[PDB]
Amino acid sequence: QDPCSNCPAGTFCDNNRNQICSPCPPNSFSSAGGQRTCDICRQCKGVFRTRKECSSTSNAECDCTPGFHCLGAGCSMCEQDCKQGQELTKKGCKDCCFGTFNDQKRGICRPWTNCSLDGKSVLVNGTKERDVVCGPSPENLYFQ
C-alpha cells in the first residue's frame, strides 16, 4: 500500500532520503500524519509576540505587543488600542456613532445622558469624546 500513511504528525514522508519518514526540519511542523512536507512555522517578530511557540506538531501563535490588539483570526495584524472617542469593532477602531460617546482609552461607545428625561437643560453638548454636561432645570433662575 502507501507507507507515507504511517508517518505521524511531527514527521513527513521524505521523497529525498532513503528513509520513509523523516522528522520535520527545524522551524517547521506537521499537524497531521501522512504529509509529504512540513509547514514553515509562523514567526512572531516586531509588533508580534510569541504567545505559543512552534512545536514539531503545532504551529506557533502570535499576539500583539502591549498597547496593541490583534485584528483578524490568528492575529493577522496588530492595531493600536483605540483612543478616546472610538470603540473596538471586528474591523478595527471606529468612531462612536452620533449621539454616543467614549471618554477613555479602550472604552465602549455609550449614549449621552438625556437631560430632558430628568427635566434638565443642556449646558454643553457632547461629542464622540465627551458626555453632555446637563445644567439645572430650564425653569431654574439660571435661565431668564
Binding site: 517547521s28 512536507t37 509547514d39 496593541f68 496588530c78 493600536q80
Partner: protein, 152 residues
C-alpha cells in the same frame, strides 16, 4: 532529476541586508534537487551544474500594524563571482500608504535568463526606503527565489 531550486525567505522584519533562506527540501515550497546546496553562513545558493537558468524571485509584504507604514522595499540578486557592472535581478515593490481603500499587502514578481556555472553563488539583498518600517513585514512563505535550468 533536473537542476532546479526554490528557496523561501526566513526574514520577516524589514532590515537592510542579505536575506536568509530556508533550504531544507522537507519544507513546503522549498525544493533543492540535484547537487544544489545552500551555504548558511554566507546565505548563498551554490549552483550544481552549468547552464542557462530561468531565475525568478517573488516579493510579497503584508501590513502588520493597521493604519501605518509606507514607502518601498527592494530585492537584488547578487552573483559570486561577479563582469563589473550592475545586478542580475532587481525588483522594487511599493508599499501603499494606509487608507480606507488601500489594501494591506503588496506584491512584485520578476524573472530573467541567467548564465550560471557550477560552483557559482547566488545571494539576495534586501533594501528598504520606508516610513514606519515596523508596520510592514515580509509575508511568510511568499518571498521566494527560484530557478530551473533551460538548457536540457
Amino acid at each position: 532529476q533536473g537542476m532546479f531550486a526554490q528557496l523561501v525567505a526566513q526574514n520577516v522584519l524589514l532590515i537592510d541586508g542579505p536575506l536568509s533562506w530556508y533550504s531544507d527540501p522537507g519544507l513546503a515550497g522549498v525544493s533543492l534537487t540535484g547537487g544544489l546546496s545552500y551555504k548558511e553562513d554566507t546565505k548563498e545558493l551554490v549552483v550544481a551544474k552549468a547552464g542557462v537558468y530561468y531565475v525568478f524571485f517573488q516579493l510579497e509584504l503584508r501590513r502588520v500594524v493597521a493604519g501605518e507604514g509606507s514607502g518601498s522595499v527592494s530585492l537584488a540578486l547578487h552573483l559570486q563571482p561577479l563582469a563589473a557592472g550592475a545586478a542580475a535581478l532587481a525588483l522594487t515593490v511599493d508599499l501603499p500608504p494606509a487608507s480606507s481603500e488601500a489594501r494591506n499587502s503588496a506584491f512584485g514578481f520578476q524573472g530573467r535568463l541567467l548564465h550560471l556555472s557550477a560552483g557559482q553563488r547566488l545571494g539576495v539583498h534586501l533594501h528598504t526606503e520606508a516610513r514606519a518600517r515596523h508596520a510592514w513585514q515580509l509575508t511568510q512563505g511568499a518571498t521566494v527565489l527560484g530557478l530551473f535550468r533551460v538548457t536540457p
